[PDB]
């Protein structure tokens, strides 16, 4: 790796730490969990909260801040769900096949999540994704990169400068490819695995989108969402 | 009173009971209270919740259901804050000059409320209103009427059939005037007092409106509100 490459790693890693609370102390302020879509209020707040973190992370990816305010929104609106599926993995436990966040109230089985309006059609591959990914036992360096790589994809509906964003993503893909080669022993086939994950996040992105429209369309359900969720997941161009 | 008159009283009273939980058990599901607008999340949920109750109450006021869907929204969007200031009084305590709702976490001094984005310009007369009203020691029959009278005012911006709504409100004002004459000893001057209150709710309505625009305009504050609050307090016609 070179200095410029490394600087990007230290940059992404610090951005992640600044936007990811390992104490999950902020969950106590979401509308309480309830075990008729009883888990929607809590999860809609968990997700709304997460989006705020993804935006905070994105603003620190080197170069992103220099994109057009419109490109920033375009990349964000379309890759937000994917970044949240990626960052959530840092709390997914293969043991109890759930997301453990500080305490028991903040531990969500495939059961809890069902009461949020989502079906197995999403929950099924979602967990599968979490397991396969959890198994790659990536480093924080690689973990944070994969997020920046996914967020800086030029193949998103809305992207104007789909050529510069093409550069950035590449400048990142290298740092990752390189690191995995130098700093990750036994990871001689990792890169290919990771990139394969960014492709699975596409089918998941799609699924959530349809399932989201279904719920979103019902006001007795959308009135449960947050102004930020509605806007980022809304289709207003 | 006549039978028709009484039937309206039993109708309003049952509607109130069905839309007002004396246990305040639903407050445990709002985003937790915090004592930088720390009380906004909790109060925005308290208010969003209240609006849902006012709509539920309104749908049961005899005749209201027969108004035009547009008239219903017009009356609701403009008199919602007033109905919430009226129904809140059922929990206002002259002792600790606060709103006691089941427990200590759900007890809001003039202090707590300040951290919700509102200034004394509103909080001052608001409490004054609560005291003066709390002192009239109205009956539940009169209390529920005053709410229906206020909600069915034809002098609201948006009202199309401002003549029929003129009838209904009158049909209610009588039942009240009559009851106070027959069923309320010592209340030979009450009616005038109550009606005077509906006039104070107008200056308060105005104040909250301006203060609401101020907050509403800031996305770092409006993203804290609920989809229902934004819509009912929003100025979209």
């Amino acid at each position: 790796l070179s200095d410029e490459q490394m600087q990007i790693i230290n940059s992404l890693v610090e951005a992640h730490h600044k936007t990811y609370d390992d104490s999950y102390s902020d969950f106590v302020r979401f509308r309480p969990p309830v075990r008729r879509l009883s888990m929607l209020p809590h999860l809609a707040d968990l997700v709304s909260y997460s989006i705020q973190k993804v935006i905070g992370f994105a603003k620190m990816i080197p170069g992103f801040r220099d994109l057009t305010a419109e490109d920033q929104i375009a990349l964000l609106k379309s890759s937000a769900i994917e970044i949240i599926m990626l960052r959530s993995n840092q709390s997914f436990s293969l043991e109890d096949m759930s997301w453990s966040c500080g305490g028991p109230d903040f531990k969500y089985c495939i059961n809890d999540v069902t009461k949020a309006g989502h079906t197995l059609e999403l929950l099924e591959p979602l967990v599968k994704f979490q397991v396969g990914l959890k198994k790659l036992k990536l480093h924080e360096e690689e973990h944070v990169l994969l997020m920046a790589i996914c967020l800086l994809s030029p193949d998103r509906p809305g992207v104007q400068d789909h050529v510069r964003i093409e550069a950035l993503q590449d400048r990142l893909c290298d740092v990752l490819q390189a690191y995995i080669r130098i700093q990750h022993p036994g990871g001689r086939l990792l890169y290919a695995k990771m990139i394969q994950k960014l492709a699975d996040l596409r089918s998941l992105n799609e699924e959530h989108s349809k399932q989201y429209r279904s719920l979103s369309f019902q006001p007795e359900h959308s009135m449960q969402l947050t102004p930020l969720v509605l806007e980022v997941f809304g289709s207003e161009v | 009173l006549s039978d028709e008159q009484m039937q309206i009283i039993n109708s309003l009273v049952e509607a109130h009971h069905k839309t007002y939980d004396d246990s305040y058990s639903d407050f445990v599901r709002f985003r937790p209270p915090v004592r930088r607008l720390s009380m906004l999340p909790h109060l925005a949920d308290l208010v969003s919740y209240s609006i849902q109750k006012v709509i539920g109450f309104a749908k049961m006021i005899p005749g209201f259901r027969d108004l035009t869907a547009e008239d219903q929204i017009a009356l609701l969007k403009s008199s919602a804050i007033e109905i919430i200031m009226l129904r809140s009084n059922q929990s206002f305590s002259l002792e600790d000059m606060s709103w006691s709702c089941g427990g200590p976490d759900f007890k809001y001094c003039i202090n707590d409320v300040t951290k919700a984005g509102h200034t004394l310009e509103l909080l001052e007369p608001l409490v004054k209103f609560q005291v003066g009203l709390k002192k009239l020691k109205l009956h539940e029959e009169e209390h529920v009427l005053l709410m229906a009278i206020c909600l069915l005012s034809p002098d609201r911006p948006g009202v199309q059939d401002h003549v029929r709504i003129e009838a209904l409100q009158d049909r209610l004002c009588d039942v009240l005037q009559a009851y106070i004459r027959i069923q309320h000893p010592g209340g030979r001057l009450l009616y005038a007092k109550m009606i005077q209150k509906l006039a104070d709710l107008r200056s308060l309505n105005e104040e909250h409106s301006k203060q609401y625009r101020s907050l509403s305009f800031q996305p770092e504050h409006s993203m804290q509100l609920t989809p229902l609050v934004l819509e009912v307090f929003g100025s979209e016609v």
Partner: peptide, 10 residues
């Protein structure tokens, strides 16, 4: 539109 995303992106 995107009122909230802007405020957060500055």
């Amino acid at each position: 539109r995107h009122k909230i995303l802007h405020r957060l992106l500055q």
